[PDB]
Structure 1
Amino acid sequence: EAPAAVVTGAAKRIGRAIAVKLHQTGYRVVIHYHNSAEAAVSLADELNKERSNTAVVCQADLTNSNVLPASCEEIINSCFRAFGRCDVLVNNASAFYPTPLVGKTVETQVAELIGTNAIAPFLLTMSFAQRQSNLSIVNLCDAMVDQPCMAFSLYNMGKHALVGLTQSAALELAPYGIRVNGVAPGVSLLPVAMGEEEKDKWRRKVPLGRREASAEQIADAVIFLVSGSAQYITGSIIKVDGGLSLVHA
């Protein structure tokens, strides 16, 4: 029997690259998505034509609410229903937009930015562990958490909380043989709404090649951490940033 993975926000960009690479390594995959239904089903279709019955999709909003615990439970339940086991969880889904200290209500901004980036990872980790060999969780963090973008306080709060979860969950789930680690991109795939001039500005900041990480490069680090080559690694966060975090103002 092949092992099974849940990947959150897996329809496009980095989450798709992680899902694809896990599938190429021999995992069966749950492609979680929120709004990108067409891209999700398209991806599932490509993977299933490579190996029959190895990919399913699963829709869920990961905004904080009183029903979020049930949604996260159902995500993990979908992996067990499709494949009979759940070996790996990748917490990739993330809301990302500014929240100036000095449109959506603030309560909605808190719910989305802290829900997607921190509370849903926590609830999915709870559900994953309570349902349970090489078991692991990988959280997508941010290499620039201590050198944050101006006006992104709530996003930064969420990613710092995710670092805390990674460490707290590593410590508490170690007795159960569940490893918990992080992968911290610097600049990888730039925002679609970003103009080429702004993208180039960011690219020229990166010491190693003056270019962003490919989605495959991020996925490589995730694959290492779930592999038997990382069997003693837990509570670690691997920066995949081309040196960006090392560059002063």
Structure 2
Amino acid sequence: EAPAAVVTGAAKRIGRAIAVKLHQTGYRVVIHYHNSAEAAVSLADELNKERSNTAVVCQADLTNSNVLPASCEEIINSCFRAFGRCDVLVNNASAFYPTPLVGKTVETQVAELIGTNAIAPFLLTMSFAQRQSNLSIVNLCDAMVDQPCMAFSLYNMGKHALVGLTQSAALELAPYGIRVNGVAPGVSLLPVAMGEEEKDKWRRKVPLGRREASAEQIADAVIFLVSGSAQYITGSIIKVDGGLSLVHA
């Protein structure tokens, strides 16, 4: 019997590469998505063509609300329903947009940015652990969390809370054999809405290669942390940033 993984926000970009690499390694996968239904169904098709009955999709909004605990329990339940087990949780889904201090309401911005980046990872970790081999959680963090983007306080607060969660859950779940770690990209696949001039600005900042990470280079670090070569690693966050966070202003 093959192990199974949940990857949140897996229809596109980095989450998609993570799901694909997990699948190539021998994992059965839940592809969680919010809006990207066609891309999700498309990916599960591709993976199932390769090895039948090894991928399903699971739709959920991960914005904070009184029903978020239920939705997170459902993502984990969907893994047990399809595969009879759940060995790996990857917390990848994330809202990312500015929220300056000086059309969405501030209530909604807090709900989305803190919900996706922090509260949903927390609830998913709870549900994952309560449902419980080589078990582990990998949280997608941010190498720039101490040198934050300007006017991104809510986003940056969420990513900080995710560091806190990584550490707290590593400590608490250790006696259950569940390891909890992070991968912190600096600049990888750039925002779809970002202009080409900004993208090149950022690329020119990276010491190693003057370019962004492929989604695949981020996934590689995720694969290492879930693997048997990382059996003593818990509470660790691996920067995959080509040296970006080392460059002064």
Query: Taking structure 2 as the reference length, what is the TM-score of the superposition?
Result: 1.00
Identify which range, 188-197 or 208-217, moves more after superposition: 188-197
1:146-174 Cα offsets, whole Å, 9 max, x none, are 00000000000000000000000000000
Quote the Cα distance in structure 2 between the aligned partners of 1:55 and 1:176. 27
In the other structure, the counterpart of 2:116 is 116
Q: Across the two proteins, how many residue pairs are aligned to each other? A: 249
Deviation of 1:196 after TM superposition, in Å, equals 1.1
Deviation of 1:81 after TM superposition, in Å, equals 0.2
1:29-71 Cα offsets, whole Å, 9 max, x none, are 0000000000000000000000000000000000000000000
Quote the Cα distance in structure 1 between the aligned partners of 2:88 and 2:156. 25
Quote the Cα distance in structure 2 between the aligned partners of 1:172 and 1:9. 26
Q: Tell me the percent identity.
A: 100
Quote the Cα distance in structure 1 between the aligned partners of 2:193 and 2:119. 27
- Secondary structure at 1:175's aligned position in 2? helix
- Secondary structure at 2:75's aligned position in 1? helix
Deviation of 1:91 after TM superposition, in Å, equals 0.1
Q: How does 1:232-243 map to 2 (within 5 A)?
A: 232-243=232-243
1:109-135 Cα offsets, whole Å, 9 max, x none, are 000000000000000000000000000
In the other structure, the counterpart of 1:223 is 223
In the other structure, the counterpart of 1:47 is 47
Structure 1 residue ranges (4+ consecutive) displaced by more than 3 angstroms after TM superposition: none
- Secondary structure at 2:46's aligned position in 1? helix
Deviation of 1:195 after TM superposition, in Å, equals 1.3
In the other structure, the counterpart of 2:139 is 139
Quote the Cα distance in structure 2 between the aligned partners of 1:198 and 1:234. 36
1:154-201 Cα offsets, whole Å, 9 max, x none, are 000000000000000000000000000000000000001111111000
**How large is the Cα RMSD of the aligned pairs?**
0.3
- Secondary structure at 1:109's aligned position in 2? helix
Deviation of 1:99 after TM superposition, in Å, equals 0.1
- Secondary structure at 1:206's aligned position in 2? coil
Quote the Cα distance in structure 2 between the aligned partners of 1:243 and 1:198. 19
- Secondary structure at 2:6's aligned position in 1? strand
Deviation of 1:218 after TM superposition, in Å, equals 0.1
Quote the Cα distance in structure 1 between the aligned partners of 2:62 and 2:201. 32
- Secondary structure at 1:99's aligned position in 2? coil
Deviation of 1:202 after TM superposition, in Å, equals 0.2
Q: How does 1:1-249 map to 2 (within 5 A)?
A: 1-249=1-249
1:193-237 Cα offsets, whole Å, 9 max, x none, are 111111000000000000000000000000000000000000000
Structure 1 regions of 5+ residues with no counterpart?
A: none
Structure 2 regions of 5+ residues with no counterpart?
A: none
Quote the Cα distance in structure 2 between the aligned partners of 1:84 and 1:38. 26
- Secondary structure at 1:89's aligned position in 2? strand
Quote the Cα distance in structure 2 between the aligned partners of 1:191 and 1:170. 30
- Secondary structure at 2:81's aligned position in 1? helix
Quote the Cα distance in structure 1 between the aligned partners of 2:126 and 2:199. 38
Quote the Cα distance in structure 1 between the aligned partners of 2:247 and 2:38. 39
